[PDB]
Design a protein around this ligand. Sequence first.
Ligand SMILES: [Mg+2]
Ligand SMILES: [Mg+2]
Ligand SMILES: [Mg+2]
Ligand SMILES: [Mg+2]
Ligand SMILES: [Mg+2]
Ligand SMILES: [Mg+2]
Ligand SMILES: [Mg+2]
Ligand SMILES: [Mg+2]
Ligand SMILES: [Mg+2]
Ligand SMILES: [Mg+2]
Ligand SMILES: [Mg+2]
Ligand SMILES: [Mg+2]
Ligand SMILES: [Mg+2]
Ligand SMILES: [Mg+2]
Ligand SMILES: [Mg+2]
Ligand SMILES: [Mg+2]
Ligand SMILES: [Mg+2]
Ligand SMILES: [Mg+2]
Lengths: 271, 77, 149, 104
Amino acid sequence: AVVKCKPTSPGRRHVVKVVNPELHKGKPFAPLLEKNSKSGGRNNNGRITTRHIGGGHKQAYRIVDFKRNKDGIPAVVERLEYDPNRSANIALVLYKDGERRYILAPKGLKAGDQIQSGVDAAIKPGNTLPMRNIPVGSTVHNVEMKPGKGGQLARSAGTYVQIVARDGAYVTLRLRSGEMRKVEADCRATLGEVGNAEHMLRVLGKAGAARWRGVRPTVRGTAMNPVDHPHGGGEGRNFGKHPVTPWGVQTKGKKTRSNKRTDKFIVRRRS
Amino acid sequence: SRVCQVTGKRPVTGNNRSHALNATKRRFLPNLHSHRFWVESEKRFVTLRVSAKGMRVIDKKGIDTVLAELRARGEKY
Amino acid sequence: MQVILLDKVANLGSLGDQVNVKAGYARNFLVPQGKAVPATKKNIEFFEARRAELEAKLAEVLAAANARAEKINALETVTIASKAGDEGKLFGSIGTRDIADAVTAAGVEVAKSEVRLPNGVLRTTGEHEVSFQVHSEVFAKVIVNVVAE
Amino acid sequence: MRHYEIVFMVHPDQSEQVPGMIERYTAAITGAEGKIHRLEDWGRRQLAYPINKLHKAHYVLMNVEAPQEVIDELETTFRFNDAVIRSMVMRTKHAVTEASPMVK
RNA sequence: GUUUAUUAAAAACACAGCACUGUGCAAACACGAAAGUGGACGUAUACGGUGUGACGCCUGCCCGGUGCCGGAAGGUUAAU
Ligand SMILES: [Mg+2]
Ligand SMILES: [Mg+2]
Ligand SMILES: [Mg+2]
Ligand SMILES: [Mg+2]
Ligand SMILES: [Mg+2]
Ligand SMILES: [Mg+2]
Ligand SMILES: [Mg+2]
Ligand SMILES: [Mg+2]
Ligand SMILES: [Mg+2]
Ligand SMILES: [Mg+2]
Ligand SMILES: [Mg+2]
Ligand SMILES: [Mg+2]
Ligand SMILES: [Mg+2]
Ligand SMILES: [Mg+2]
Ligand SMILES: [Mg+2]
Ligand SMILES: [Mg+2]
Ligand SMILES: [Mg+2]
Ligand SMILES: [Mg+2]
C-alpha cells in the first residue's frame, strides 16, 4: 500500500511511500547472508566504467535461490523479508527436511502457504516446474534461459512472462518488454507474477532519496565544455547537433545490438 | 601470446599506407586458432594454438613429426 | 587431401581407396575416428601391400559380433518403469541411457551412443520402436515398453 | 448438498482412457460424501463444428450431487487436463436420474 | 544542496518528477592490443544514454533539410 506523505517540509512534499506491513521487521536469516561490498562503478583497472554509481546505504547479499533445485520436497513460507539488493521482496522458505532458503516471493504468496518445486509440482503460484509441464497461456516468472542455470527472465518487482506457444522442444515466451524469445522447454519457471507489484508507484520525493540507493547525480551533457562531452560549448544554451552518448554513439534511435549468436532464439524484437 | 606454436609466427608491424601514402603503424596478426589434434600414438587430444599455415604443415608432416619438434624446441603442449 | 580408407564410408568408397576428400573432413572425422590414414607414400606401402586383405580379417570380425550383439536379442521383452502424471503427462522422461539401462539389464551390455530415436523424448506411455545402429551396416528393431509407476 | 450437471468432451485420441478418468472424478464425488446420480458415457460423437482443429470427441454426461468445494476443484481438474477440451458444469435444481434424450 | 582552492556562490550545475531511446543477459555501454572486470552476483517495475527540471493548467502545426529507424524490386559500386 502506498502512503502519500504529508508536506511538513519540502522534500516530504512529494514522497509517496510503499508501506508493506507483511515484511519482516527484524534481522534477516544470518546463514544466508554474505558480504556485498560496494564498488562505485569501478572495474579492476580502477576507472569509472559505468557512471552515476556510488554512495548509498550499506547492503548485504541475500543468497536467493534462483536455480530452485529441491525437487519433490514441499516448503512453507516462514516470513517475507525486505531485500535491498533487488526490487522484489524475498521469502524465507522452510523445507520439510529443515533447509531454509530464500526465494523471490510471487504475487499472492504470504507466510503459511506451502510451495514445492519439481516436475510434479501443483500448478499454483510459487511452484517451479519445467516449462514443458506448465500449461501454455499462464504467467510465470523467474524463468531460466538454459536448463539448470538459474532464473533470469522476469526477476524484477512486478514482472511476468507469458508462455504463448509450445512447439516441440522450445517454448515461445512473450517477455516483459514485448520480445518473443524462444527458451527451451526444459527450463524451470516459477508460477505467478512476482511480488512487489506497486514498486513503480513509489516517488522518491527528494534529491537525497536517490543518493541513498547509490545514484550519484547525472550531469547532462549540454552543460559541459566541448572537451568534456560532444554536447559541450555554446555562448548561451546551444545544442545544434544530434544527441549522442559521451563517446559519439547516437542515442535517440540507434539500435546497438551486436549479438549475432542468439538471433535464432528471437522471434520478434519489441515494438 | 599471438604465437603459432608450430610455425613460430608472430605479429609483425607494418604501415596502413593510404591513397596519399600516409603511414600509420599497424600490426599483422597471424590467423591463430586453438585446435584439438588427434594424436594417434597417444590417443588423446593435444590442444595446439596453431595458425592456419600451421595446420597445412600438420596435415603434411603429420602430428607426430610436429610434436617431435615441439619437444626439442622445449615447448609445452 | 589424398587419403586412404580403412572401412567403407557411405558415399566415397570401400576399404582401400585413394579418395580426394576436403581437408577438414579427414582432419576431423576420417582420421580421428580411425577410418583413414593420410595417404603418404610410406602409408601406401604399409597398407596396399601388407594389409590390403589382412584388414578384411579384422573388419569382418568387427561385424561378426554385430549379429552377436543383435540376433541374441530375440527376446524383445524390455520394460522401463518411470513415474508419470495421469493418462500420459510423464514426470520422468525416458532418454537414451534410460533405454540403454533396460537393454543393459535385458540382454547386451550396450553403449548409450547406439540408441536411435525418432522422437527422443518418449513422453507418452505406450509402445515405441527403438531402432539401433550397433554397427553402421546392420540395424536392429527392439520395441521398448513404457509402464507407469 | 448442491446439484450439478457436468458434461465434458474428451479428446478422441484419449477415448481408451475415459474410464481411467471417471474412476477418479466419481471417486472424488463419492469420496466427499456426495452422491452420483446418472453416469452416461455418450461415446464418440461427430461435432457440429471442429473445436481445436478436430472433428470428433468422446462425451460423458455425469450428474453430480456434491458440496461446492469439490466441484471448483473438479473444474480445475478439467482445466489442467489437456485431454478434456470442453467442460460445462451446469447447476440443476433437482437430481435427475431419468435417462437422457441421447441414450436412445 | 553544489560550483570557478586564490577577484564570479549566481538566474549556473544538481535535484525529485516527466519523456524519448537503447538494452533478452556471455545485455547495451564503459575500461582494457587481449584475458578480464565494471554493469550486477542486478534481469525490462531492470540498466545505460539523452534532453527537460517539483507542483498546477498544459505541450500546437511542418518529415522539405540534417540524422535515426524500417523497406530491398531496380540502378550504381569493392576485394575476388
Ligand atoms: Mg545513469
Ligand atoms: Mg540532470
Ligand atoms: Mg535524470
Ligand atoms: Mg560550462
Ligand atoms: Mg568533441
Ligand atoms: Mg543564445
Ligand atoms: Mg539555430
Ligand atoms: Mg610521418
Ligand atoms: Mg541554497
Ligand atoms: Mg572564487
Ligand atoms: Mg568550496
Ligand atoms: Mg566568492
Ligand atoms: Mg534546464
Ligand atoms: Mg486535456
Ligand atoms: Mg512541439
Ligand atoms: Mg526527414
Ligand atoms: Mg521523408
Ligand atoms: Mg537505410
